[PDB]
Amino acid sequence: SEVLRVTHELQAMKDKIKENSEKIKVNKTLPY
């Protein structure tokens, strides 16, 4: 019901946002 739409349905930011921050971090090259 409400939760199943939120337990893993939705709440996917815990995977997508995790990955997305991975690439923004990886692109933090050493030089500045």
Partner: protein, 37 residues
């Protein structure tokens, strides 16, 4: 009729507590997934 609306009142209170827990879950998640989005 034996119970003077005491055990039944406690059971109704437990049902209302479960309903309140559901309402709190709704309130928390409606904002948590909002923040994640």
């Amino acid at each position: 009729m034996a119970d003077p609306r005491d055990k039944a009142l406690q059971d109704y209170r437990k049902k209302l507590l479960e309903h309140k827990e559901i309402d709190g879950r709704l309130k928390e998640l409606r904002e948590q997934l909002k923040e994640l989005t």
